[PDB]
């Protein structure tokens, strides 16, 4: 019934949204584009039951190394990640080298 539509409908909406984020992030330096990957579902019968979103996968192919001239602006060329910390003590990883 509605299950075959609404679930799939949801997927479509989600897709557009991530696309919008790409358009909304085409200028941020340490950004990676993301794309949705879907997967169908099945019951014991031979009929489908719609589509569930399986994963939002980024694409880590490196971008262009645009320069600015400041000393405290470093850029990675291959696999790697800057290791950041917070005041509390938690750890994070990033690629934006616009330090200060």
């Amino acid at each position: 019934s509605f299950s075959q539509a609404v679930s799939g409908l949801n997927a479509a909406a989600t897709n557009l949204d991530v696309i919008g984020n790409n358009i909304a992030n085409s200028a941020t330096y340490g950004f990676k584009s993301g794309t949705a990957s879907f997967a169908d579902m099945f019951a014991g019968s031979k009929v489908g039951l719609g589509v569930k979103v399986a994963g939002i996968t980024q694409d880590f192919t490196d971008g262009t190394t645009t320069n600015t001239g400041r000393g405290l602006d470093v850029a990675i060329s291959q696999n790697g990640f800057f290791r950041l910390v917070d005041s509390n003590g938690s750890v994070f990883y990033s690629r934006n080298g616009q330090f200060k």
Binding site: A39, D40, M41, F42, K46
Partner: protein, 99 residues
Amino acid sequence: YSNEQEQVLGQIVLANFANNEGLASQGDNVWAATQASGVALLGTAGSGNFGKLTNGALEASNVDLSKELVNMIVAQRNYQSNAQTIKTQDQILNTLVNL
């Protein structure tokens, strides 16, 4: 490898089935061979009855919306036709039972 050499960490194995349409889908986009669906009948990607493996490419959705956007309409019209039958069946039974 860093020693100007390279290992072989494995070779991708395909699976070609003589019978088809017996592959029962199992929820996620995977099929399972069942009875009379045929044996696995393994074989490499090179020769025989197998195809090339393009790198960096992905399969399409194999559906063209223009085709089903009209099948949906004709199936609907069939559905109200059925319902008119079953309406008539309910109608018929209705007159006889009240009589």
